Design an enzyme around this catalytic site. Structure first.
Site, PDB file in Angstrom:
ATOM      1  N   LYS A  17      17.237  25.050  11.044  1.00 25.90           N
ATOM      2  CA  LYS A  17      17.169  24.607  10.042  1.00 25.90           C
ATOM      3  C   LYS A  17      16.768  25.946   9.027  1.00 25.90           C
ATOM      4  CE  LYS A  17      14.187  22.278   7.538  1.00 25.90           C
ATOM      5  NZ  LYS A  17      12.985  21.506   8.282  1.00 25.90           N
TER       6      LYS A  17
ATOM      7  N   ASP B 267      19.042  19.739   6.679  1.00 23.43           N
ATOM      8  CA  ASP B 267      17.205  19.319   6.643  1.00 23.43           C
ATOM      9  C   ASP B 267      17.848  17.831   6.534  1.00 23.43           C
ATOM     10  OD1 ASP B 267      17.594  20.143   2.902  1.00 23.43           O
ATOM     11  OD2 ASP B 267      18.679  19.152   4.025  1.00 23.43           O
TER      12      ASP B 267
END
Ligand code: NA
Length: 209
Positions: free
Chosen positions: A131, A149
């Protein structure tokens, strides 16, 4: 909730959000195009700090510390992170200090194939997983990658795009969920990197980074 409902809501905020999205992306492109190794390193550090923290916090840390990410000793960096409110100042400071090994390599990474650059950062940059590596690359102007996220994953689950929210990642699983979101971005007519900013506008009507 269905996908079409999500697309319709995004279309309703699109016109108002677009100038903010475009202006923010111009700043990302500027960093990738004109940024020095140290400028890129500070953005990588922002991504280390916001792994489980708000954009607001990271922006404040970046403003207050600046090039300190490059030159401060561990103890002084941890103290400044504690002062700006980070919940894990010692460990994040340690990650940043360790990552200084990457100074000299970032300009090439940001210009390289973004999928390969992301793999590199996942393996080699401390405090940077799938991420956060996506986040860093996007923040230097890359448009090809999703930032999966918790907010984005919860949106995807709520609208039936995924069945469960992953609490950890692998290459294959991140690429898989990213490709699902890419098709949604394509349906909307935006690149994954910009689409992310439209998705975040939904929360509070802000475009941070
Ligand atoms: Na890593």
């Amino acid at each position: 909730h269905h996908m079409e409902e999500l697309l319709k809501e995004l279309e309703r905020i699109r016109e108002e959000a677009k100038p903010l999205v475009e202006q923010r992306f111009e700043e990302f492109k500027r960093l990738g195009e004109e940024g020095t190794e140290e400028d890129l390193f500070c953005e990588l550090s922002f991504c280390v700090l916001t792994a489980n923290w708000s954009a607001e916090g990271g922006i404040r840390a970046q403003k207050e510390i600046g090039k300190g990410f490059v030159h401060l000793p561990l103890e002084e960096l941890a103290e400044k992170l504690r002062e700006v409110g980070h919940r894990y100042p010692q460990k994040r400071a340690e990650f940043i200090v360790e990552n200084r090994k990457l100074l000299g390599k970032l300009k090439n990474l940001v210009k390289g194939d973004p999928f390969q650059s992301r793999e590199f950062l996942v393996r080699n940059a401390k405090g940077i997983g799938w991420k956060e590596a996506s986040h860093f690359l996007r923040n230097t102007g890359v448009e090809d990658l999703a930032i999966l996220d918790k907010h984005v994953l919860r949106l995807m689950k709520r609208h039936g795009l995924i069945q469960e929210i992953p609490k950890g990642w692998s290459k294959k699983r991140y690429l898989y969920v990213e490709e699902i979101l890419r098709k949604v971005a394509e349906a909307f007519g935006e690149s994954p990197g910009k689409f992310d900013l439209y998705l975040w506008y939904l929360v509070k009507g802000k475009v941070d980074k």
